[PDB]
Amino acid sequence: MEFLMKISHLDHLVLTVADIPTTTKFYEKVLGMKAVSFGSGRIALEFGHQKINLHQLGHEFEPKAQNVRTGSADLCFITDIDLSDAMEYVENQGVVIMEGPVKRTGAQGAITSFYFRDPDGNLIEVSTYSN
């Protein structure tokens, strides 16, 4: 039984942030994610069937990235909300949209995207597969 190595999907990733409460408030209010906690005070943000784990700078958990850096992430999330509604919503939270709607390439084909930054300066791209 020869086999080929394969990865199915990304389960989660870790962001290191200056202030966990600031971050959870943001992702809940702006992206509608679900902030949860588990174990010994571990914090995460849930969306669909995936999550983002949060570490607070200075209270990181091992093992971790070699070069931990706040604001070093660049992430693209799909929404099933009409993109113009999504943009209006984000702006309505007082968030500055830096570009969009613009055509980009998603994993599965053409997408339309808009961009803004989270409280640590991570780049957030919110996108739709709707043509």
Next chain:
Amino acid sequence: FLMKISHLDHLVLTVADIPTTTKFYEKVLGMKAVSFGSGRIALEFGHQKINLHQLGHEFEPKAQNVRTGSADLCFITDIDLSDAMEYVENQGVVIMEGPVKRTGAQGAITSFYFRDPDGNLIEVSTYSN
């Protein structure tokens, strides 16, 4: 309106050397390196991808604080974890730890860990029991 996100489509890693990274992810994780956009490179897996930037190359917009080796990722494989770990080892990769019980988005997972060429932390895991 209740704002909502369904899933993560992709993310961008900034790396010292795209060809080195591309060869690593193809050989070690079975990903497919593809060209897209204006001279860009991505690594495909399942229905997601990782977009690559080379440190120092001009691109906008990007993370506020671009940093090689700053990512910390957990991937699910459908391949038996012990077989996956043996495979990764045979590529000459040093396994930091594993198999160990950890926590996934949807419950308990079993994981092993290693670093990529830039020092990003890669966790390969399964929900299989």
